[PDB]
């Protein structure tokens, strides 16, 4: 048994973020 430092096992699940788009729409005031 030769003790040693192991590999740093990484799992990253990122916050799957939306940069959320805000858009204006308009019904074109129809007579």
């Amino acid at each position: 048994i030769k003790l040693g430092m192991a590999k740093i096992t990484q799992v990253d699940f990122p916050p799957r973020e939306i940069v959320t788009y805000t858009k204006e729409t308009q019904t074109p005031v129809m007579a």
Partner: protein
């Protein structure tokens, strides 16, 4: 030629342990949506099924199974695992699993005595 078979009988193959993790995840979770009262018994049954199928191998190991089960809410997730073993015999296995509602991470370890 018997020393190679004796080394293969006590080696940590990552793929067999990962298949045991896949069968324990698909046995206990399935594809059912996140119910937080069931997350306790899902983590309990994945760790207990992985500890059951790992101890049926008969290899001289000490096994550590840690499990992370997590709802998809747009929240962020890092799990890290560096350890301190003998590098000639010991190894690890960390498996990312997901479905529609949930992220499942199981880190499985096997350390020779």
């Amino acid at each position: 030629m018997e020393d190679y078979q004796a080394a293969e009988e006590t080696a940590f193959v990552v793929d067999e342990v990962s298949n045991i993790v896949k069968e324990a995840i698909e046995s206990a979770i399935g594809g059912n949506a996140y119910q937080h009262s069931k997350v306790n018994q899902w983590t309990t049954n994945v760790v207990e099924q992985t500890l059951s199928q790992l101890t049926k191998l008969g290899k001289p190991f000490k096994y550590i199974v840690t499990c992370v089960i997590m709802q998809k809410n747009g929240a962020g997730l890092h799990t890290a695992s560096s350890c301190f073993w003998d590098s000639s015999t010991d190894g690890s296995c960390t498996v990312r699993w997901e479905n529609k509602t949930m992220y499942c991470i199981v880190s499985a370890f096997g350390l020779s005595i």
